[PDB]
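HOLO CASE FILE
Compound: 80E
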Amino acid sequence: NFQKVEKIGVVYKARNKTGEVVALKKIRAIREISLLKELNHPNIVKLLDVIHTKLYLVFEFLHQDLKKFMDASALTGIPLPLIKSYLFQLLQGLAFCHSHRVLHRDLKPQNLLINTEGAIKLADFGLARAVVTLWYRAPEILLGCKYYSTAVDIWSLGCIFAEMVTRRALFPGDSEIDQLFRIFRTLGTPDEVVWPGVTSMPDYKPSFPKWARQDFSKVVPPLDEDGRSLLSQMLHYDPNKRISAKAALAHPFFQDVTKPVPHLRL
Ligand SMILES: COC(=O)c1ccc(NCCc2c[nH]c3ccccc23)c(C(=O)O)c1
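Model generated. Tokens follow.
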């Protein structure tokens, strides 16, 4: 049914024998996933079909992702108005999915798809359970919290925001404890003062080193106080204190938001 075009489980660019070009995911429940076909938002990649016969998911196709765009933009950096537009749009997408009680759980630049018209869209949701990259994982997940909240996605998006600004990954760890300790060295080792209940987390150890907290002026330097304030709220340790997607959309950082068009080399 599909003429495979290129390898993008495994994901292929494919052509429907409708002429439509799509992203085809072969996975190698069915009722629950099918509900997502009719929940649509401009900032979420559209799920066109679900087929189980091996599980195939057919998605709308977009040509580039934010990881490729950040690498292409690394000599100059993404312009601040575009960073701001992308952050605003991703928060609109998260506000929508969270309002329908759907979490992403695995946001990273390579799952954020962009087009020539200035849009960015959430893709590659980690909905199966409902080298692994840990750089965007919320600290409650790393500490073994059994129940994720919407706050895990805000953490990941804050890490992505910092990376778009500074052109380097915020917390590039290579094991769960290295990831945790990279977070602790920058934001301070969490305690009951800033995160009530942290010492009760399944994987918390009293023997964790106690690092002091750095300053956000050192963390995302070029960024102004509106952006640093929003980032600090997206990176609160306590998931209950971390800002929601809806509240973040009202932050003063977005008062001058626009929708620029990026320069894409396809
Ligand atoms: C084993 O894999 C899976 O079960 C699975 C299920 C759904 C997926 N995406 C759904 C995108 C979506 C479309 N409309 C939405 C409204 C709200 C929230 C999300 C959406 C993906 C993926 O993106 O890969 C995988």
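CASE NOTES: The domain at 2-60 is CATH 3.30.200.20 (Phosphorylase Kinase; domain 1). The first helix runs from residue 30 to 35.
CLOSED: yes
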